[PDB]
């Protein structure tokens, strides 16, 4: 399941997320949310959870960047004013 | 079909559900489970599903409340430690 969120960067000054990079002997795993801090715009929405994969932010698609470039772009965008839209793929299960 | 599931919040941080409210022109249709987080207590029990309707939490009936007041109650109760009982209607 894919989900799309909008964060109001008016009230909040930061997302409150850690970003964990999966890399392997291929290293293209992607980037995921590790934890979420109370106090930020993500916790206030409720939707995202640790382990969610981050696919795209405002438009930029991260599915084929390197982990280090997708974060370089996330950093620059939270570093500017304006609403931040995120879309993520949510964690799965079954063993 | 109306089920009653009991959940342990000891074992989890959240119920893991988003809550979606329908409203008519008059007023309210009620509140429903819009999506399930794995990860939470609800998916861990497996019995409720997306589209189900939430009738009562913990002996408190939402049957005539407004959407908003019922979501207040619901939040007020979740925020407490303890087991949580949900009564919900299966989507047919």
């Amino acid at each position: 399941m894919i989900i799309t969120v909008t964060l109001n960067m008016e009230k909040y000054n930061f997302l409150g997320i850690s970003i964990v990079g999966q890399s392997n002997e291929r290293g293209d795993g992607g980037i995921y949310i590790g934890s979420i801090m109370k106090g930020g715009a993500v916790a206030a929405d409720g939707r995202i959870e640790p382990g969610d994969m981050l696919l795209q932010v405002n438009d930029i698609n991260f599915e084929n960047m390197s982990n280090d470039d997708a974060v370089r772009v996330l950093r620059d965008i939270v570093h500017k004013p304006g609403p931040i839209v995120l879309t993520v793929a949510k964690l799965e299960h079954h063993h | 079909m109306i089920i009653t599931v009991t959940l342990n919040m000891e074992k989890y941080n959240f119920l893991g559900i988003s809550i979606v409210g329908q409203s008519n022109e008059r007023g309210d249709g009620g509140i429903y489970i819009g999506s399930i987080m794995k990860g939470g207590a609800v998916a861990a029990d497996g019995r409720i599903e997306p589209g189900d309707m939430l009738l009562q939490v913990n002996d408190i009936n939402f049957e005539n409340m407004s959407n908003d007041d019922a979501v207040r109650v619901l939040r007020d109760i979740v925020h407490k430690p303890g087991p949580i009982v949900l009564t919900v209607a299966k989507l047919e």
């Binding site: 409720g46 939707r47 | 119920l15 893991g16 809550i19 409210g21 409203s23 908003d68 979501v71």
Partner: peptide, 8 residues
């Protein structure tokens, strides 16, 4: 008309 209310 659906509105997302919150999540918990």
């Amino acid at each position: 008309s659906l509105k997302l209310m919150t999540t918990v």
